C-alpha cells in the first residue's frame, strides 16, 4: 500500500495506545503490533496493526533501534503526525 500521513490527537494524560515491535536491530521496521481500544491511535481511525512507522513528526525512524524509536515516539505531544506504510 501507499505511504499515508495520519494525524493523532494525544492529551497529555494519555498514551498513544499502540504496541510496538521491530526496529533496526531486528532488521525490520518499527511496527504496530496492537491498537488499543478507545485510545488516540484507535480513535484517529488511520493506524492499523501491521503498519510500519516510517517517521513521526518528521523524525525518520526507518533506521533506528527499538528503544530509541520508542523513546522518540513517547516524547511526542498534542497533534502528532505519523508517516506509515502497509507494504
Amino acid at each position: 500500500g501507499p505511504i499515508r500521513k495520519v494525524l493523532l490527537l494525544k492529551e497529555d494524560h494519555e498514551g498513544l495506545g499502540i504496541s510496538i515491535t521491530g526496529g533496526k536491530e531486528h532488521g525490520v521496521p518499527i511496527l504496530i503490533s496492537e491498537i488499543h481500544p478507545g485510545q488516540p491511535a484507535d480513535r484517529c481511525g488511520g493506524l492499523h496493526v501491521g503498519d510500519a512507522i516510517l517517521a513521526v513528526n518528521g523524525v525518520n525512524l526507518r533506521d533506528t533501534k527499538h528503544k530509541e524509536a520508542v523513546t522518540i515516539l513517547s516524547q511526542q505531544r498534542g497533534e502528532i503526525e505519523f508517516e506509515v506504510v502497509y507494504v
Binding site: 498514551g15 504496541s19 510496538i20 496492537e34 513517547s74
Partner: peptide, 5 residues
C-alpha cells in the same frame, strides 16, 4: 520485545 506507547 514489545513496547507500549
Amino acid at each position: 520485545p514489545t513496547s507500549i506507547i
